[PDB]
Design a protein around this ligand. Sequence first.
Ligand code: HEM
Ligand code: HEM
Ligand code: HEM
Ligand code: HEM
Ligand code: HEM
Ligand code: HEM
Ligand code: HEM
Ligand code: HEM
Ligand SMILES: [Ca+2]
Ligand SMILES: [Ca+2]
Ligand SMILES: [Ca+2]
Ligand SMILES: [Ca+2]
Ligand SMILES: [Zn+2]
Lengths: 149, 149, 140, 140, 162, 165, 147, 147, 145, 145, 161
Amino acid sequence: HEHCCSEEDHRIVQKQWDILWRDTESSKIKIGFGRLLLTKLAKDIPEVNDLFKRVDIEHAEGPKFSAHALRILNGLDLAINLLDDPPALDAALDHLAHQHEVREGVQKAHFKKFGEILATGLPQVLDDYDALAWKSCLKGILTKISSRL
Amino acid sequence: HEHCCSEEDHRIVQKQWDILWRDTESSKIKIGFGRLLLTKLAKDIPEVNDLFKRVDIEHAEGPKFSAHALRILNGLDLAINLLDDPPALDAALDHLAHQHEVREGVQKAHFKKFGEILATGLPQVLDDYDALAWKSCLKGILTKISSRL
Amino acid sequence: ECLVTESLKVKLQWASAFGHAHERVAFGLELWRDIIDDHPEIKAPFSRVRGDNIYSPEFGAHSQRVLSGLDITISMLDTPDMLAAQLAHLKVQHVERNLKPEFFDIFLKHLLHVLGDRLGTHFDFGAWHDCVDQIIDGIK
Amino acid sequence: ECLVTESLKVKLQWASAFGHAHERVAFGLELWRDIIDDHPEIKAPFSRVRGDNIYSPEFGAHSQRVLSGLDITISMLDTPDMLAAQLAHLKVQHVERNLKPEFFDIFLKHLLHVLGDRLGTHFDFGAWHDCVDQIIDGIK
Amino acid sequence: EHESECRGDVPECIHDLLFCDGEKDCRDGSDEDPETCSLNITHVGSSYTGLATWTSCEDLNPDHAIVTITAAHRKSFFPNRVWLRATLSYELDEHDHTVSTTQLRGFYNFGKRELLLAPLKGQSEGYGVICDFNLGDDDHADCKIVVPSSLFVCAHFNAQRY
Amino acid sequence: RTFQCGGNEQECISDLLVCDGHKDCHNAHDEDPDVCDTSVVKAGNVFSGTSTWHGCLAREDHVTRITITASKRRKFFTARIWLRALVESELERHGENVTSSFNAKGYYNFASRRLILLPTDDHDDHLAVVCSFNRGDNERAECHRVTEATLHQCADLFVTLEEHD
Amino acid sequence: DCCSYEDRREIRHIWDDVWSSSFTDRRVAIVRAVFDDLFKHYPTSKALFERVKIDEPESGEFKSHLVRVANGLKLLINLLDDTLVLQSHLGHLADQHIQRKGVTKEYFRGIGEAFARVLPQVLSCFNVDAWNRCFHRLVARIAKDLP
Amino acid sequence: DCCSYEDRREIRHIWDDVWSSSFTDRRVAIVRAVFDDLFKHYPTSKALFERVKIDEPESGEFKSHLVRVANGLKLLINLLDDTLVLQSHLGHLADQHIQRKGVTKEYFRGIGEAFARVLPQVLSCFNVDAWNRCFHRLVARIAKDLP
Amino acid sequence: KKQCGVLEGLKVKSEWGRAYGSGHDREAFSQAIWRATFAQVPESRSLFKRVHGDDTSHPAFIAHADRVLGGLDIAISTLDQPATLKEELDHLQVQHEGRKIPDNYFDAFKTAILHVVAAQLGRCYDREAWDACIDHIEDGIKGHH
Amino acid sequence: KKQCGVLEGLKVKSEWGRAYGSGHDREAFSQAIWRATFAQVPESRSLFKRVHGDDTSHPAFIAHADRVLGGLDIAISTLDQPATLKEELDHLQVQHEGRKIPDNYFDAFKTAILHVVAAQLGRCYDREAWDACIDHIEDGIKGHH
Amino acid sequence: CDEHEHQCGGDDPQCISKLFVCDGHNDCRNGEDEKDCTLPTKAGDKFIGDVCFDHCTKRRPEHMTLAFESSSIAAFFTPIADLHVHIEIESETDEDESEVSMPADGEYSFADHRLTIHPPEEDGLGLVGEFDGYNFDRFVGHIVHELSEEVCAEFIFHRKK
Ligand code: HEM
Ligand code: HEM
Ligand code: HEM
Ligand code: HEM
Ligand code: HEM
Ligand code: HEM
Ligand code: HEM
Ligand code: HEM
Ligand SMILES: [Ca+2]
Ligand SMILES: [Ca+2]
Ligand SMILES: [Ca+2]
Ligand SMILES: [Ca+2]
Ligand SMILES: [Zn+2]
């Protein structure tokens, strides 16, 4: 239970997640990627479309949503970049829990799915992907984030 | 006007010009090369044949000329090898100017041509050639040599 | 079909593979050599750019110009309006010559073979095939 | 004919060449690529394991499974009773498909070509040819 | 590997298994002079500490590591090695001060001047530790917390004695 | 870009804390007075030495004279000493002794004991100078003339603080 | 119950000690010794291998089998650095056992115990826990649909 | 007015800062911003690009153009280490502009000024002189017969 | 002295990429910035009482910091997409309105950022440019000028 | 405490591989072992009077030592082939019967081996296992238990 | 400094050609190239070498004495002092017991405090000892193949005082 997402584990994740932000046009990427990630979520579970209604998910390319795409995708960044400081990461995530707690409609099963999606997506943009390491870490993150619903 | 044939520039020229003298039979090379260089000059401008008459240019393979081939080609060496000591190089070249001044018949247009020839020849014997660097340096040299005519 | 990720992947890998300065000429050369040895029929249209001697500067130049265009197209996979236009523009510069549409199918075969070496096992064949293909058909 | 030394030689060289972990996938990949480019007819039976995209994980898996078996056979060259059995076992897993016996003659051609690169001039071609051959016929 | 140089003026190399065994093995006998066979390091109660900064086996942010010797005997007929037992302790939570304490077994190599300890086998399978005292004296060492199994470096800490 | 702490409690610190006023290292070596002696680059200090050229100029081995003009230290950000300085180069050109000098602005970083001096936009194209005081003291430093862009090294320059007597 | 990267490294080494020689002999005796422990505990399973002639221990038809098992394990471990491929072959390895009528989810948990009892005897410095952890992750996926 | 090797190195770097992303967006805005400065100073030239539809800035038929120009420049710079090839493509680049009726020797000297005014704004640490030097050598050869 | 236009944006957006960095550099970059901010206006510590503003090194705050720069990232990272940026800024604007944050603080926080960034980038860094853009971004969060 | 069975054999056989080593390590490994043996029972030096047992560093003895380990190698290296081992042991048995070698010495020599091997292998080494096998090998040379 | 240049040290370094060290002209600003020109191995002196790594000598001897017979410096080329040396050796086997005193020429370069002793026997083996710079009572002596410059024997030589 304590061997999940270990130093080496995340040291890896971190390294691999960086292959992404090598070029200055991170925005275009983060957006496109996050956009797709959320879309593919609403695809498999529609009751989501209503949750992201507030951010005009109806218009994927709409700034309203594009901004959102960043915020989330960028939050995942924060999570990953704090992997090497458990107490901080903890706090950082707990905070994310609360930001999701007051958003009724969002249930655990959503994250479980988003996780599966994220796990099938990453390896499509990263040539070097270590499924084992990632799954280990993503789990810890996604869980702590939804631990309030 | 002071960025022509800079330290890096000639450091390069020098390095590339050395690819040539790796084998002990420098004579055979210097000669053949210098021989060709002068020949190809008389080819494009015949009034030259009369200048090199004194050294039996008529007999390209004739020792009389072969020796000459060296002297000249070897002078170019001196020039190149003193590129990293402007005052010396200067003096060394000025001297070459005088050795050409008292040789009537030799006009500037000759050097301009010899330069173009030299620039088309070098890259034929050197696999690694940096046209820009060389042209920069060869210019400075050829000019200072003919600055008396 | 080249969607959003399948592009970024290529856009990214192209970076590492292609490279910068000389590293490129090397790439181009290696590429065309493998292509011409497989189908010497191509040395024909490349007559204007000394295709007989691929190591020559004349051809070297060409080689580069080519890869460059490829760079452009690849850098436009995300924006359709520009790609569709760019591709159409390239088709014209080609159609004007006896070009067996299979030549491109060949070019592609090798471009992948080469990137394969350069990138190694990480090379996302899928993404490239689906993506570079679309670029060829727009010129074929 | 693969005697006692001619085996140990291969058993040993296989070690250095094949390698460990990733080093292997790389080998497998390089191998199959060269094979498929030479005879694209093979992409056919490899349809189950995405043979169109050799860089895919599906095929990658396969690639490895193969080499592994090859490892086994090679590690049995010294013990005949096990080899004869193992080989027979492999023949079955293959016969069930339209497999031109020449395919193996091809596979061998490349396996040697590749080991050639990996091992260099030390590569004991003789030993391998005499020895790996004996493994193929038992499956051909 | 498996050899260390004499401390004499002549940098001769002799096998580790030969230092301090009672028989002049080095050209000059440097492998037997006291300045070499000093037990100063393996003295009972000896303790070395530094700041462990982990690079491979635990969340933990730089914390204090302490490898201290708990008992050590030298079999009369086999002097080459000073078999011993020690304890490796490193802070867990810098705030509530919890701290891990694994018991170790091992020896000290006169040749390499290296302390090699591993867990006693059967106690939560913790870590081991390698300390080189090649730092010049008997009080400074370059310790590295390893994983017994592969001696793979879990973390590193430059230690001092006291 | 990181600061190594005391040889006993070894640990890395970002030079944005190099010497900021808050104990960041376990041994606090990142606030140890001797690490942050402002005197290294006290205004008025003068460093001279020979500049041997091997990269971007056909200059004869001449001397350079870096002299600190001024030095501010933001009270809300101590990790850096901002400073202005005067770089002179007594070199021989066409004829006799000339002097090619220029005004510079830059900073001093305790963590690396690096002193970076860039030209005050002097559009005459001067090579930024860079010194490291890695020599065990605050008197001597190892410098190089470089292009502000690539930081490519055009020349080697070993300076020494001039005595005031 | 997570196979850490460190643990993988641990195993990627532990293995290099059992799978040293390129000669069957060793690996055989070990894999065998493993099964003997499986059969002494879940005798039932024994019958499953009549196809390979377990009644003839030194048969060769069976020895070869043992090797294939060994090598199949080797292949797994030697894939721990290429996750994605491992994840696939790991599935393929399941299917090869699902079509083998009579193979329970239990027998696997049983062979797992086997190694954990054998390995610690064939080599020293065996991180039983680390092994156990990553072995379970491997087994779980193999016999997910096996029971 | 000589493009030194050092200068080449300077540029081979300066460029790596503008031509960072493999996404059009950036390079576009820059090359555009460059032309906008060419047109604000030599408005005559504007007409020359009706073929690519400059009247439709966001057209795409035009954006693609900008890119081609950008990339054409990129290709040049990324050739500064292979002199001989550069010297040839540099010619080929001329011919592509000589056959473009209406392109003066002036317009080039004008776009040169353009960059020298734009670049220093899109990135810091721009050796305007070094750029200027090697850019002129490039331009000169391109429009030697253009006037 | 300059407005956060097209180019000046690209410049800051790029330079920010280098200064921001990742991993520990980040956890510090933010650290440094906040220390510089609070050092300027100790009064402001009272606003982050909820997220341990008393101890800049407390995980809670570390998170907060790293979380703040996060937004700033999105902001800067989109200075070339007015449409989107607009949104992010507006979003932030909300998370802040309500808190009595004087233009006094924002000013200090900008200064902080600038000084740290300058310390991090060494030589290649345009001050005016950043000033202009950090400003434009802050304006979008206050609503003022 | 354990018998030299199948596995315990493989273990010793493997560990021995590492401890034995080659070249100089060997010339010493043996050296160390003998010194440890003679130190225990100086009485035994008298038996190797023929091969300069007086000076453990004399070539004659060096040979002898390196020669002895040799047999021990064959022994251990075949603990997994009872058939063959049996033979080697028997062969040794002969070269030894006749010499008044008390079970007392063999005991010391085992101890020696064990202590040195442990010193050489550092951490990965099962004592019981070696004890058990070195024993089984010695028994095969004495004839006793 | 470059391959064939001498470093003058000090708080302000300067590289000059090794052909200038101890030549009579003040080539270095500081003067190093001329203030330390004392010849260590001068006529009469004897040096005893203790072996510690011998993979080539014909005798693989325990020691090796190095006697300096004569030494003269050319008045016009101070940078190199020519030496005449006898390399003595005390061998002793089972089949015999030999003694040797092979004579060889050699020079000492103040340029880098390195005395090169030309091969004594026609087996292509010569000695090359480089001095500390400040010691002069102990130098590491490498026995090499002149042609190749391969090291195959190291002896620590001490001045027999
Ligand atoms: C690990 C991935 C996730 C991260 C890191 C994450 C991050 C975020 C962040 C930063 C916000 C914006 C809070 C703010 O600034 O006001 C947010 C809001 C939200 N998240 Fe997540 N989220 C993740 C997964 C999910 C999942 C699985 C769901 C799906 C039901 C979800 C549903 C929402 C909703 C509905 C909002 C409200 C957005 C709005 O209207 O403002 N999130 N999330
Ligand atoms: C950079 C290339 C050149 C170099 C370095 C060079 C060098 C020399 C040298 C060393 C001499 C011999 C002086 C002596 O020892 O008495 C010489 C003589 C001469 N050079 Fe050049 N030269 C060069 C180019 C030219 C050109 C372009 C011309 C063509 C008109 C030219 C015409 C002559 C003539 C006519 C002589 C007289 C040779 C004789 O009869 O002795 N040189 N040059
Ligand atoms: C997908 C890859 C390809 C791209 C992106 C591409 C791009 C280019 C470009 C930009 C030019 C230079 C036009 C100019 O500036 O004058 C060019 C010229 C040409 N291409 Fe392609 N090309 C590709 C594939 C092919 C293939 C398959 C053939 C091979 C038969 C081919 C034959 C030609 C020829 C003959 C020329 C003109 C040579 C000349 O300038 O004399 N191209 N190509
Ligand atoms: C001497 C080298 C060869 C060896 C040792 C070998 C070994 C293997 C092994 C062990 C498998 C995996 C069976 C399984 O676990 O399901 C396999 C499958 C197969 N082999 Fe081979 N093979 C060799 C050569 C070939 C050749 C020449 C061909 C090429 C036509 C071939 C075609 C196949 C096919 C089509 C499969 C089944 C793919 C699937 O699982 O869907 N093999 N081979
Ligand atoms: C440690 C995990 C295991 C691995 C890695 C493994 C590996 C293998 C392999 C490679 C094959 C041979 C496939 C072929 O070449 O056709 C196989 C077959 C089989 N396995 Fe496993 N196996 C494992 C555990 C088990 C367990 C626990 C049982 C249950 C008793 C089992 C029962 C079988 C049977 C009966 C076959 C069929 C053999 C035949 O008749 O040819 N396996 N296994
Ligand atoms: C900095 C140097 C310049 C570069 C590197 C450059 C590059 C290019 C390139 C690559 C093309 C496209 C060729 C094709 O794909 O068919 C082109 C076309 C052209 N260039 Fe330039 N150019 C430069 C300067 C100029 C200048 C100063 C003018 C004059 C205003 C100019 C006018 C044109 C025009 C009008 C075309 C035709 C575009 C069309 O209608 O397709 N160029 N240039
Ligand atoms: C351009 C600069 C600024 C940006 C981009 C910014 C961004 C942020 C962000 C993203 C949050 C976290 C919101 C959440 O996830 O709940 C935040 C929170 C906050 N900001 Fe700002 N902020 C800026 C300037 C300021 C200033 C000047 C102050 C006052 C000194 C300030 C005071 C706060 C406070 C008190 C919080 C909430 C703390 C909490 O969560 O308890 N911010 N800011
Ligand atoms: C398992 C342990 C032992 C092994 C494997 C062993 C092996 C050997 C071997 C191979 C030889 C050399 C035979 C030859 O080539 O002529 C030898 C010789 C001998 N062994 Fe042992 N031996 C062992 C224990 C002992 C012990 C305990 C003693 C008594 C202290 C002993 C006394 C002798 C003597 C005196 C010789 C003959 C010396 C000679 O050649 O003059 N051995 N032993
Ligand atoms: Ca000793
Ligand atoms: Ca850590
Ligand atoms: Ca600090
Ligand atoms: Ca001198
Ligand atoms: Zn200056």
